[model samples]
Target: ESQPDPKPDELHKSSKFTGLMENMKVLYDDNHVSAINVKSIDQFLYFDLIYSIKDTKLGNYDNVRVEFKNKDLADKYKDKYVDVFGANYYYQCYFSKDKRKSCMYGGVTEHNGNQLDKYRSITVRVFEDGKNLLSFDVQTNKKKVTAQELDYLTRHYLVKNKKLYEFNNSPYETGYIKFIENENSFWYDMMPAPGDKFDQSKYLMMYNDNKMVDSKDVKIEVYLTTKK
Candidate 1:
């Protein structure tokens, strides 16, 4: 028989696998202590820009802004951010030595719970001004990959929502999920870990139903081209 359709929650789940990943988007700004806030709301998540130093507003974080390019695009698709992001994004799939282990990233997830919970990892690095690079691995535990968290990475930076999310003057890509919708509707997948497969283990993305089944470790990885 055909596989059953995944539930609404299953659409955005991380896994309890092991792997490492490097950053792709290299920050050109030489300014140290720059802050970034990646978050999700309604259905879409956004990467907000924050400077460490005080700007013309005379405050450390007063310059907190978004990466929009224009006004019309931002307004049209603001509400639908979650649907598109959830619909698209990235799926960084890789296997450990001997192919005993596997892991996935939910692109760039956001912390909808609280502000302090928002954080970022240096995924990739650059040498000699954006030259020579490597994609290293990271140890992401269950605690690190929440539903909202892993959802960001798996969508491959694609935003999805039920409403029309808009962003005027947003440098970020427009209609990420729609960009992929021309080809497909959904993103990646994460299977369950069979028995005796102990290369490593870490839990992420908890499901109300799967939680009872003790199946909280499943996520989709988001992959960007600009591996810095």
Candidate 2:
């Protein structure tokens, strides 16, 4: 349900926090702050500052700490203080801690296996072949996907006229498309049976994560491929 808390010893020794003390000093000013210490727990970073009474807005206090989520720190300091607060480092730490959270909330995680490499767009082209040959251009986030994977994924998410149908249903009864690998894309030919009907206008290609719970209808562009 939650990521393990980061070890204090490891946090203290991590090179990611190098020069953090000096950066905090510059950000908070030395006149009001006497000493500073940094700590990390889970996805949050704590800056414990010993404040002097010179600018006492909150009276004199020792060990007054300011807490910041790692993401917040990354967002606020990533561009301004590149040397001290490396945005990428904070973001990496934050996301690593938040991986479990993402999974719990039905969000894609690496453990879900290729779920993050979602379908971005798709296009269908009817060629001039007498057999009613159709070509599908599928764009995905990842560079490479296997024929079988694409076939299964497409069948699982494909929709027709606001109705969800199984791959074994009427229109897709013939067989699955055989996809060929292309960099971040796939090419597939649909060779349906003689009686099988495919109306590109009424069909929608939906994209669902590996969990298959959340889905979005991908934009489908239909075109006629002329023989040159």
Candidate 3:
């Protein structure tokens, strides 16, 4: 998944080859090439990325994408999330706790149900088959992850340790390598890269075309670079 060649109908900038997307690869490569801590305090829940340390130190909300395998467990905390004082001074959300209706729009208290558009600009997703309705209060929709795309994506639920990311079985076995498929084009002329050549999260999105989509969330350690 080296630098994708420009398509006949697309401009380079119009393409979504962003450094932010690379962050995932940076994480995967950093994790893959480097050492892996099969055991540690990687206790992030629900696609958990430990924002604690950075929050405490830098006050930034840098989230790592992890998958929790257990479907029951992932389902248990789908929309339920929490906001805690991070390694930085900012109170970034860490994990999900409950799905009750509240002010999740701006991560503030005053902004609620209908008053969001005022002080808080928020986006909430409601999914229901009619029998059950679920509400997801989102802080932001900036980071968008797709469900695993394969012959059996929806079949099995992928689970990641909420805290530790590299402890259990993963689809790719390596988190450092993220797939970046051409969203506009179907999976055509997609070539696999050498086992090497991928690097840092900040450079991940440049690798290939699609971030592997998974229904289940797995656990990953906050700082993948430490070991890798």
Candidate 4:
């Protein structure tokens, strides 16, 4: 993971994310605002740069925005914003949490569907020792998932260089399933709760299998350096 060097508050009074901002490539810009794109391992993010005071039910406040590729994902965050912010754009669904070492963010109005849901929940943690941690679990629903969502799960969530372990393989089958043609292919199996026994959990990459089981059967995890 890559991190931006820490800067004095003076450097970031204008940008709340200054602690995490560096080498942002501009995609669109106006004098008062700009849309910038950034790529971290397994994730592509877009951010808005606001340079003027804006009107809100709460009064005039500065606004920051991060665009999500999936509208459903953005829409999923409506409730979180509604309780914390009273702005016309609050319906756009974006939120941020700042830790001493990293910032975690998400919300998009364009998620595909429950079938595409890979994890029951996702968590990201930053440590004082300069390490970043992520953990997520799958639901035990008895439904099959698309390969598209499967790929997204691994690429976007699993830790770098970790393997997806198989817990429900046949006795004669190999216990290890390699990453698909793409990296993080088996990400759904990357994490299992520490001390939680791995039994009766099965992760199959082939989406064509019409009958699928719940994700809670499996757990995927990530640990890495936070990107700046």
Question: For all candidates, what are the clash counts?
Answer: 73, 0, 63, 24
Candidate 3's TM-score reads 0.19
Task: In angstroms, give how far residue 191 of model 2 lies from its true place.
Answer: 13
| Candidate 2 local distance difference test against the native | 0.25
RMSD of 1: 19.8
The list of candidate 3 runs beyond 4 A from truth reads 1-55, 58-192, 201-228
Give the top-scoring candidate (TM-score): 2
Q: Between 2 and 3, whose lDDT is larger?
A: 2
Say which prediction, candidate 1 or candidate 4, comes out ahead on lDDT: 4
Q: Write the per-residue lDDT of candidate 1 for residues 1-228, one digit (tens) a residue.
A: 223433444432112311211121111011111122432222212322211223333443322122223333334333322111111112322221112111221222232322233333323121212233423222232232333323333232232221111121111211111011122223323222322221211222221111100012232223222212
TM-score of 4: 0.19
lDDT of 3 at 212: 29
Q: Could you list the CA RMSD of all candidates, in the order they appear?
A: 19.8, 24.1, 18.5, 19.2
Candidate 2 local Cα displacement, residue 56, angstroms: 48
Tell me the tens digit of each residue's lDDT in model 3 across 94-161: 33451111011111011112122222112222211121132222122112222121211111112121
Model 4 weakest lDDT span, ten residues long: 21-30
Model 2, range 124-216, lDDT digits (tens) per residue?
Answer: 332222244544544554322223233333433333221123233222211223222232222222222222343221111111111111122
**Whole-model lDDT per candidate:** 0.23, 0.25, 0.22, 0.24
